[model samples]
Target chain A: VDTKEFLNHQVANLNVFTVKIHQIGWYMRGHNFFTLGEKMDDLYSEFGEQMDEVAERLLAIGGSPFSTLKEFLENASVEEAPYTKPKTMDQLMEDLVGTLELLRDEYKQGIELTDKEGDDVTNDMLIAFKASIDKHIWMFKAFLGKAPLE
Target chain B: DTKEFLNHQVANLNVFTVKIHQIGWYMRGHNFFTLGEKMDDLYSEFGEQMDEVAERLLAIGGSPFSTLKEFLENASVEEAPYTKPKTMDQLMEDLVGTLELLRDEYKQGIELTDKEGDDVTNDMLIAFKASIDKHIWMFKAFLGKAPLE
Candidate 1:
């Protein structure tokens, strides 16, 4: 264990929150994959195609600071990816932290862009990101302690 | 809201299904118009559309209901009219609203049909509703409500 605990409070905080959000995201993904996927196939064949384009575009952009998968793996503060099936909750935790960190960086960059050229859409998207971060924080806290409300 | 709309829409299509099933053996069912009890003038506008679709629908084989009351309970669209039709014009408008909802439902069914291995019967239902939509425009004309581009 590196036990070095470097003072990157923002990253640590985000990881804690990300874990909870990822769990919820997983549940949604599972349900939609089974039920709503059929609906999508019916409505328009291109709906699924469009979703693919959107996902690829988001990931390929400066959304992740590291340009390539190798660069990301080397610089990631989190553990390396495993070749085997994820041990559900264990892998979920890692994903939570990783995603949260990535999101924060993305939002931070959005802010910088707005300051540089007043990118309204980028700013609004970042605002939505902030809302998600707040949700993740609430969820991460759930694991360590108890639900905030009865 | 969408789910509720879907449930009602599915129920509406099932109306034809039940009626057809009844007709399979020459069974009796409720009819839409009363002739002259409380005024179902809305039918005046949509009657032609209904007739066109009904012809294609019955061609496949089914018995038509003789009364609306018998049809209301099982009909997917809510049958309770807000007010008794005081005028033929008013009745025309109300029926148009009902048909509009049904039209939306049929569009959804078209997509659903393709998903369910492109079922032919459901495709027929979509076509039937399209015929009914024309009558909606006729009624709208009676109410001085023209379709906009």
Candidate 2:
């Protein structure tokens, strides 16, 4: 039951956010389509403030946030999966696999956005993310690897 | 009834794309009817691409294909929409499609750099290519299609 719930939950996030990030990436793509000379500084700064709000709420809940932008951006799980509780190996595998599988879109979008912008470094980082999820899937699918399906 | 309702939500959601990072960073664990995952994978992928550009640019100085910042400035990919996406599927497909282009471009960049003996450029291209391929794999996996077979 727990495995099922987590699968549903993880996939739901994967499904919804996957869709959400893709759209944002799309809009970002189009944002560059019209040849505007404006920098996204104004938008990025505003979004940073919103991130502050999310952190604010978490802090309100006695949750601590990272102290710097680098840490916030680099180490936040708003993008990564946390190593956590679960009794069965199967559950752990499912949650981990489902989590990454769900995020494939956002990773793709990030790569495209950077590629379009010619930021190879960012594109590389996106590749690493993709590699990570792929690795996770490999591990998660281990259970299905030649196991008797009785 | 279904299509209209779907379109209404889709239109509102599409607006969020205009300021996605803010939406992403602001999105709390408690936001998705208290159900959702933030852009953890996105941040990671973006970070990797960011790293590739920095490393390559720093290494190449003025030999051409130097900085990601400049590359982005010169890129021809479309920007994010000014309005919200009309539906989740539309958004997902667009993102998937975008990465596909990036992957292709990275592969192309690799070929071009190889011709020019631009090792730094080649490295950068590989970075993009890897990211693009990884993403494509993910999207295909998500769709449950016959993968990389």
Candidate 3:
């Protein structure tokens, strides 16, 4: 019960982020579509890997990852990107960074919570995944011509 | 210890950037253009990686080495001897050695950060190790060798 809440929240957010990432993949337009398209594939694949590990670990430890679209959107901290609003490459890149930041903040929270609760397992997982988000944020920011820290 | 481990990584990566670029430029014979182009992209990525590591170190209260002298002193990889017209096979072989060396450092860093309970640094170390492992795999393939597995 201790880590269950935060873990589910994490699952919830991934559910949302994963779908948005897929949407960005569909809508993103650029001269170098080949390169950017593969980038989306990789990021979405990474999201899948992170979610599978986190959710499974939750089940092993004593709870289930959230299962419904409603549960995911309600519990997730970021807003869903609408399919009706197709975005330019730059726009989608910026959007992805913001989206990753939402997940990044929760991972930070999870890290603190697990550390305080002595759940080193969960803390370690959260930290590892958070670093992935940081890398994405940095890469996307670089694409957007912004400083990584900015 | 996390700081020390990360600083060492930063130092190593800087040397790695220089070493790979040197190979890229110096490589000749078969796959000259291909290997040179490959090295060109990799060195840039390696440079970015170095900056990121140094910035992370700075963020966590470590002053990452700012001078060539510091990088030379702290780096685990030896500085390139500075002249050669090497074959693609030879250039890639050298790169494989460098990747393996970085992989070892990253492994040690991962353990150090984990023991210190510095999950952030541990995460970075793990990511870096995976990157090195992949680079090792690709270069090995180029050299007609199998990954150690």
Candidate 4:
């Protein structure tokens, strides 16, 4: 659609994604909390920062960010969690990296979309988002130690 | 030491800025879309880092080298001319060497800043190291090698 519609989608996805991050934080029953739990806080905090900035940037451009969680869930592409099952660290990585990959992929799409729409400001935000998310991916992969760039 | 440290990085990054520009301008091969076009983004990245590190030095009461006369003569890595165009392998090697050397400098900067209790610059250097690590990884991949390899 338009830049507004596209960024609103990002705002929504971040909305759900941040909540899911908290869900992961609390739903963990493992002892990795001695290490990995701290990282979950970092995850949500960074995502929250992104959510705020994208919404604020959209507002600056005369577009309203999606406000309600109800609206967010409807518009966001990320899935939801109910805390029915506690997750192992591996399961944690699975879902965590899954969301990162999906969100990062969508960011690439947004970057391309904004570029074609001649929205350099929006494109700048998208690129910044990609940079930090790529950092997150690398850090998480380092923790797992398969291949950082893989 | 923090003052001297950043001043040196200012020089090195300036060296890298023009080095990347030369690499882009001198590139002539079959892989224009693949290798040549990527240079513009890299040029911006280097230019942005140079400006940012210069401002960062100023923020901490240190004066960065503002003129080409002094900065052009200062560097941890050497630059070259277009006397004879280099191969893609040579270009990639040059870039990786610069990135790795800068990564080393940033690592040392982080240590020095931490020792001198300058958390501000330490934090910045950490981010810079991470950024350079990313570029090194991607370029390594381009050369058909592993991230660490």
Candidate 5:
């Protein structure tokens, strides 16, 4: 059940992305609208898929996924994005990059946590998921010309 | 660019989900807990469905909506704030009203996916439509009212 809690935390994190990125897809403007908009869309799509898979996996492991927003907000380690208007493209990119970094750190921590408990399946998922997060972090950073040092 | 359109729909649905879940918390009745629990079920399902839509949008090379502001502006349904009614019947009525809005949105999604010749998206939309119809029927029953009457 402890592992279940981690999975649920991820579910909430993913859903938060589901909404936050979806919002970006809507209000993105300026020169990068088409390009960055599509990228945000990809992120949300990935987040959504991950959310579903994690929830299903949790159920498979005999744990109920966080099924309500209340649970999500209560148990989540990530903060929900404010319900504010979309920011400029530059600002939006920064926000996204920051979020991705947060996710990367979270996944790394989750990987370590799960690995210690011998939950290899969950550990592997986090490792794989974190790999993507790291890549996205690089990509977002690249977009901002702040790519991680080689 | 067409993906932009799909993105908008997904954004609207996310907002709808957010509003529905928030409404669930304010439900009041002897059955408040159960009714709220059912709403959670609906919200969770809606969250899953919204996720699928976003992924489908990406598969089609389109972007999905990603901001709270966009959801507020793009959603057809109005937000049902907690400051409104508190009675069980009133909350039930709002739920029914919101479900109808969702059904309409899904119908729009179905039409768009059909026109785009995207069978995958269309199939998902139909399944969601059916699910919402089932919810509407159940909620109407809770109101002691018959379907579509």
Candidate 6:
């Protein structure tokens, strides 16, 4: 995909992450509720900020980011489900890790695509997304009681 | 009481918004996928409404509740602790419950605003009450119930 498509995809990814993190913050229970909820709040806020940036950048480049939910869901690399079953803290943590990994991969691709497109600004933006996703992935892995570096 | 109650309502609405989002995610069965998407729209509006409420509170020289702890502690609305709702009906019921709580809170807000002679806040509460009423009707219709029932 082109740089615009890649950036819009990340915007959609961030929107999905925003919802998932909010769910984690609200529904999480047990000993981890306190810390996990706080983390989820922080992550969702960051996702919102990143989404604004990506969308703005896309606009500046004369490309429109997907504005409707239908468009977003269709183009989004992330998936959404009606989380109908109860999830444990560990399960939610694992899900978060997987989601961050998905976004990280998308960002990795975006960075490469933007570089190939010779759009240094977009490439730099994608790099920022990748950095944030990596940091979150590591933190989430640690929350899952795994080694952060693993 | 006015400042404190408004803060709590802001907190309560935030909690309700969170529940609305989760219900939208995990809902299933029948025409639920469509309803779930509509719920997503509703929650996004709820987010906007929450922001307006916070801004109004600040305009009135009152502090809005900003912390998750404050939201959890002060909210009169119950949290949806389930990650996945058992059925479409269960999901609808959860949302209805929250909408009713929000409606009731708005009712209380209307009363307080009237007493304080704050026409602007009173009008805002009335508008919120109307939105909650619309949502309640729609959810009940989905559940095969009448508006008056």
lDDT of model 3 at position B87: 66
Model 1 lDDT tens row, A67-109: 3445434444444333355344434434544554555564565
> Model 6, residue A72: what's the lDDT?
49
lDDT for each residue of candidate 1 in B1-149, tens digit (9 for 90 to 100): 22232333434544443332222223122312332221233333334434544444444454444355544543555443234433444444444565666666666655565455544545454454534544454555445665311
Per-model interface RMSD values are 19.8, 14.0, 4.2, 12.7, 7.4, 13.3
TM-score per model for chain B alone? 0.49, 0.58, 0.93, 0.92, 0.88, 0.93
List TM-score (chain A only) for every prediction: 0.40, 0.38, 0.94, 0.92, 0.90, 0.94
lDDT of 3 by residue, B1-149 (tens): 88787788788888889888788767778688887888888888788878878867754556688888998999888775856556677767878988998888888888888787667877777877788898899889888888774
Tell how far residue B92 is off in model 2, in angstroms: 1.4
State which candidate, 2 or 3, has the greater TM-score.
3
Maximum-lDDT candidate = 3
Candidate 6 all-Cα RMSD? 13.5
Relative to the true structure, candidate 4 reaches a TM of: 0.53
Instruction: For candidate 6, write residues A32-89 as lDDT tens digits.
Output: 8888867876887688768767877886797656543434455777765544577889
For all the predictions, what are the DockQ values?
0.01, 0.02, 0.20, 0.03, 0.15, 0.04
In candidate 6, residue B138 scores what lDDT? 88
- How far residue B52's Cα lies from its native spot in candidate 4, in Å, is 13
**lDDT by residue for model 2 over B1-149, one digit each (tens)?**
22222122222222222123333423333333221132445544553454334334434431222112222334443434223423433444454565665566556667767777777667756765676677677656654554353
* Ranking of models by DockQ: 3, 5, 6, 4, 2, 1
Candidate 5, residues A52-109, lDDT tens digits: the string is 6677677667765654444555566655454355478777777777777778888778
Name the runs in model 6 displaced over 4 angstroms: A148-150, B1-149
Per-residue lDDT over B1-149 for candidate 6, one digit per residue giving the tens place of the 0 to 100 score: 56776778777776776566546544557766698678768866787677667657766877666545456667888764443327878878877888887888788889999998888888887888888899889888988997546
Q: What's the CA error at residue A137 for candidate 1, in Å?
A: 69
Task: Judge candidate 4 at residue A73 and give its lDDT.
Answer: 85
Superposed by TM-score, candidate 6 places the C-alpha of residue A121 at a distance from the truth, in angstroms, of: 0.7
- Model 4: per-residue Cα lDDT at residue B136: 93
Q: Fraction of the real A/B interface contacts present in each candidate?
A: 0.00, 0.00, 0.29, 0.00, 0.20, 0.00
